[PDB]
């Protein structure tokens, strides 16, 4: 996961 | 400007975020949106205009932040639901299992359920950990966006999610899809700040  | 959750706003004229929710500390008017998407005193700007600037955050432990508005900002107790509103009730936290939606400039309004609660997400920055997953998609520009119930209750803002080469993760099933926000209890305890609800 990213930020957004 | 009125200031709705989901809508867009820009920080320092470059990076877009999504407002997450109206909140007042005292006479002070402001909302909370997400910590990675300012550092505090960057100037917030809605269609153009300069609405306020962020007065304080965290990122990455945690990912918080919120704007401090100038008196002629309105607020308002909605979240953006397309041409539609959904009204701000309160911030009962919702269950594992209960379905919630979110709002952001990028991907509108999305819905799906809470997966898992106290997730760790491993960014470029460092880890922020204590994040709830849920499975509704968001893209890049969400970030800072509401997370909320159909009945209103706030439940905390866009942080980050397992975006693929298109920018969201909205074309993988649900099933694959951890979009994760940042709860809003411990935000609104941390600065002091209360709701506005309609």
């Known amino acids: 996961a990213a930020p957004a | 400007a009125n200031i709705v959750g989901g809508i867009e706003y820009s920080i320092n004229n470059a990076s877009l975020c999504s407002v997450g929710f109206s909140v007042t500390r005292g006479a002070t008017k402001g909302f ?28 990455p432990g945690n990912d918080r932040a919120w704007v401090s508005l100038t008196s002629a900002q309105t607020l308002l107790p909605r979240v953006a639901n397309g041409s539609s509103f959904v009204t701000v009730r309160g911030s ?8 919630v939606c979110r709002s952001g400039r990028t991907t509108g309004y999305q819905c799906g359920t ?33 997370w909320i119930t ?23 099933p649900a099933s694959q899809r951890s979009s994760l926000f940042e709860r809003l209890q411990p935000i609104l305890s941390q600065y002091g700040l209360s709701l506005v609800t309609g």
Do not use: P, W
Not at chain 2, 45 to 54: C, E, L, Q, S, Y
Not at chain 2, 92 to 99: D, L
Not at chain 2, 155 to 165: E, I, L, W
């Open chain 2, 150 to 172: 159909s009945a209103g209750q706030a439940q905390g803002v866009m942080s980050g999610a397992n975006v693929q080469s298109n920018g969201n993760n909205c074309g993988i």
């Open chain 2, 92 to 99: 009962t936290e919702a269950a594992v299992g209960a379905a």
């Open chain 2, 32 to 59: 909370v949106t997400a910590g990675h998407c300012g550092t505090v005193n960057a100037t917030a700007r809605i269609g153009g205009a300069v609405v306020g600037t962020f007065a304080a955050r965290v990122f």
């Open chain 2, 114 to 146: 809470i997966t898992a609660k106290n997730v760790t997400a491993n960014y470029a920055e460092g880890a922020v950990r204590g994040l709830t997953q849920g499975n509704a998609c968001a893209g890049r520009g969400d970030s800072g966006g509401s």
